[PDB]
Symmetry: D2
Subunit: 160 residues, 4 copies
């Protein structure tokens, strides 16, 4: 059962178009028979992908700093306690990683995945980010224009 | 959402034979009761047995790692090694220690520190009575797999 | 290289005043022996007193923290980690010898972790059940000290080997 | 409290030789200013030269390692973490961070420092990096053209 990780900025930092892409990304992850792994508290991109995944009957793993609540969009809550430190659990536990948008948090998570030699697809990050991460590891970086392209890169990659 | 039962225990070299038997059937019963099993993948004593108990009974297992192992449905790779995945303690609704050693002691203590109940099974007096001195209200001592599955059912309901 | 001695204690209403006084004196004796004190870096309880005692004797101190902020004023070197309820095996792995003053859930995790790292732990001001329970984890690494002088003498011997 | 300056760079042959000289001269100037050098505690790359540099000029050094561990001779205080993972320690413990060169590990440390809202001095990085990280946080990113520049950016940042 493949595991696809979604990173992306939080609620305040995610633009409306990026939110829409994130939901659609989560749906398509679910319809291709994959598990979604993302951050279980963050309310921008990561939440939208989880809702997307859930709305289309997919399994979601949320990674979390118990404490209250959760979200009902999370199926398997994995609580680390690690506060501001590295749940590079995403990076390491995923088959493929997709970033929707960009910010300091997300840049950090993408660079760890590359360091760990795992492929990353970059959706809706700007040219600045696309060129830098490609400059880090051109064999591991895939830029996608929209969700369907991102999902195609994810399919091509899992065959390998 | 399914209850998640954390199991902790020593590895191959320090797990007596009766503890492996107890671990294997504890996992069977975790699954049989419709709970998710959470434990370490890759530890080849108590923890590896509970996962198989659980799989053999058609349960869902999560394995925390720092390949493995047919019996793990969801691998969570942490990347730490000689550190703390406190994932077991904080992710799981109830924790069952089967046997005892340094690793397991640290994890029982962290669970009590996060104020979760722990069921101690096949641990011995010194461990039972020390953990009880830490938080008596959170520490439950079971005699056999049955008394431990029992204590777990009686804890999810509260 | 200067030896580093790790000190671990319980908290605050898990702390009695004999333990605060013993932690201060332990921390002085550590600094007087030319050793670095490594402990938790909050201005609270047993770890804080060890730190004030080391500073008072002209010792060097390292405080480990999670997060952000308010470092004890006795901390020379603050090590800020970003982990919350997550360990924080820094004390255990970085110290040559570790000393527990009192006992609580947190110190018990810390002590068990250090034994698993094959590091010697000196127990000071704990109850027979802790003493007995850790002794049963590893007889070879657990030193029960009766007072601060005994603690210091166990560290001394452990470093001389 | 003596200030702590953290240095980050690449390891093996993500590392050009002039980077190795800049790192060593930088460590040397950090120690001459009465500052502590915090770095990765290994015997390789930018971080080791910076350490050797600091020592040679009478400075104190802190080396952060994973598990378990012994570690350069230039390290006074070893901080052994056992998080084989993320030492987020540099980012959060240093007053100022200086990156010498760039690679995946460095990229994550820098983004984490900017996520923690700490200023980063970028020495000997390519303009893709200078541009990307400036795109993340203009206010926190300082491109130095050389070791003297890098020090006068620290010195001033330590003064605000």
């Amino acid at each position: 059962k493949p595991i696809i990780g979604v990173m992306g900025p939080g609620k305040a930092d995610t633009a409306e178009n990026q939110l829409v892409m994130a939901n659609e990304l989560g749906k398509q992850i679910a319809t291709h028979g994959w598990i979604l792994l993302t951050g279980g508290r963050s309310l921008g991109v990561m939440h939208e992908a989880m809702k997307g995944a859930k709305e289309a009957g997919g399994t979601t793993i949320g990674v979390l700093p118990d404490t209250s609540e959760i979200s009902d969009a999370v199926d398997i809550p994995i609580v680390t306690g690690l506060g501001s430190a590295r749940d590079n659990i995403n990076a390491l536990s995923s088959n493929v990683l997709v970033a929707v948008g960009m910010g300091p948090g997300t840049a950090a998570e993408v660079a760890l995945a590359l360091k760990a030699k795992k492929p990353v697809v970059l959706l809706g990050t700007q040219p600045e980010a696309e060129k830098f991460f490609t400059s880090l590891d051109a064999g591991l970086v895939h830029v996608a224009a929209d969700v369907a392209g991102a999902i195609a890169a994810v399919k091509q990659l899992l065959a390998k």
